[PDB]
Each structure stands twice: as structure tokens, then as C-alpha cells.
Design a protein around this nucleic acid. Sequence first.
DNA 1: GGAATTCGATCGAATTCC
DNA 2: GGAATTCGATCGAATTCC
Length: 132
Amino acid sequence: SKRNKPGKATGKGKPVNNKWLNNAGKDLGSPVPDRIANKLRDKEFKSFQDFRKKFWEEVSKDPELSKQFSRNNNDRMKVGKAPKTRTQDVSGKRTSFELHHEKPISQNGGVYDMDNISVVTPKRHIDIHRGK
DNA sequence: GGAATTCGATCGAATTCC
DNA sequence: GGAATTCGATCGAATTCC
């Protein structure tokens, strides 16, 4: 459908902490680092999947951000895989951080609109798809 | 009725193919 | 390498089965 067809990176991003994802299990998670929003902005993406792997790959290229992550998780982001969330933050076999579109795609949501993109935990992500 | 399999929105990772 | 395709996953409302 939509997150599969190509698109263009757009958005400002937000200024971020040294404890970024630290609050990814609350409300709508952690925003997309402006520092990263700058790097990805105006880039062409085949699918959201393409954007995701590129996204985490930029995080690993960031001194400030990649330092907050374990050597292990950095190894995964270097190849496009998402970071591993804290156990108390996982939901079944879903264990990697998830990117949530604030305004659903099935409701005309910017697929590649970094201002509509956020980082969450599987646990929290689920409570979002049911109002809680 | 009420338990069981499906469906369809939302996800990330592995495999296939050129 | 990179793109497309395919496989796994959790959940609630929905449909299918006795």
C-alpha cells in the first residue's frame, strides 16, 4: 500500500538529550533528532523500510547518539537493524525499538515526514493501537 | 453462546534475485 | 550492494464453526 511505495525525506526534527530513547515508552516516544533529520532530509527512499535502515544507520554515524547505546546495539544500527529495547520494554518476540507514525498512514500520514515519525518501545507501541 | 481461526492496521528482519 | 519479496509478530474487532 503506502509505506512500501517510494517517497522523500522531509521534516525539521527536534533537539535531543544524552538520554534520547530514555522516554520512548511514554506517550508518543522519542522524536527524531534534528541532527539526524538534517542528514536524511531531501534524500530519496524506495520504501519506509529503506528509510528505517537508513535512519538507524545515521544514528550509528552520530557521536553524541551512538554513545548512549551499547557496543552491541551500535553494531546493529550500523547495518540498519533497530536497537534492542530494555526487557521490561519488549512485547513478546517484538524486541527492537519501533518507529511510529503519529498520524496513521491509513489516515493520510506523512510516511517520510520526520515530524510525524517517533521512536517507541514495542510494549508502548501496542498500547497506542488501543487508546491506552 | 462461546470458543476458535481470520482479518487487517502496524511493525521489523531474513531471504531471494539481479 | 541494493531493491523487491517474503516471513514473522502482537492485538482488537470481525468472521467462521459447532
